[PDB]
């Protein structure tokens with residue numbers, strides 16, 4: 001399961017947030033985009049796949065994933081197309097929304113907070129640690 | 141060669157600005173095309189980067205975008221030690237790869253990400269070696 005991601009959209013302050021969750025780790029990446037378009041989705045996926053070993057993305061079946069540009073991006077990147085941390089992200093965005101002028105800044109603060117937050121006590125791991133451990137282990 | 145050290149540079153192509161972050165120990169890169177080297181764009185890039193990797197230190201070219209208060213405030217928030225002026229065949233490398241995929245993309249920003257993808261997946265050191273992508277996670281992993 002190291003190459004499995006789930007992608008979802010969130011709408012906030014009349015803007016769109018694209019969120020990718022690495023399913024096995026809970027690690028997230030996110031971008032704020034003007035609108036939920038095929039071009040933006042394709043670009044997002046291309047960035048994701050240049051950064052992590054992406055094999056499969058699970059999506060809602062919106063039209064932004066059907067587009068020919070998204071299909072070309074996925075073909076090129078070797079990606080196959082097919083809420084727990086999602087309500088959380090919204091939560092953290094609120095907790096810090098005041099520390100920032102723009103929405104996209106608060107979003108990236110929340111991603112930061114989420115990915116570095118240790119789960120559990122001493123002995124625990126953050127999501128950022130889990131994803132790299134999983135991938136490093138897979139590579140052996 | 142600490143695992144937490146990144147170098148940021150900029151490169152210009154077709155009248156556009158590419159901000160590049162290089163994980164020094166592994167050669168792994170991240171990049172974005174931005175409208176101009178401003179404080180807020182730079183600060184936004186750094187905050188995203190720090191959200192995705194354990195960034196302890198960033199070496200910069202001391203450009204005016206880094207001396208801006210917006211960037212210094214981002215580094216402070218993210219706990220990044222900003223090291224300005226601390227010392228490049230990487231930019232030559234990225235530009236070369238960008239050339240090899242440029243006719244597959246309608247827009248430069250797309251060709252840049254494709255180039256980043258190719259660089260990070262390229263096996264270095266022969267069939268027996270590893271890519272920058274493999275190297276960064278092997279270096280950064282705390283519990284294998």
Ligand SMILES: OC[C@H]1O[C@@](CO)(O[C@H]2O[C@H](CO)[C@@H](O)[C@H](O)[C@H]2O)[C@@H](O)[C@@H]1O
Nearest residue numbers: 031032033043044172173174181185249
């Ligand atoms: O290069 C523009 C491209 O980047 C995206 C994210 O994929 O926009 C975000 O990232 C840029 C680079 O950091 C920022 O300049 C921009 O403001 C931010 O929204 C895409 O939306 C866009 O196509």
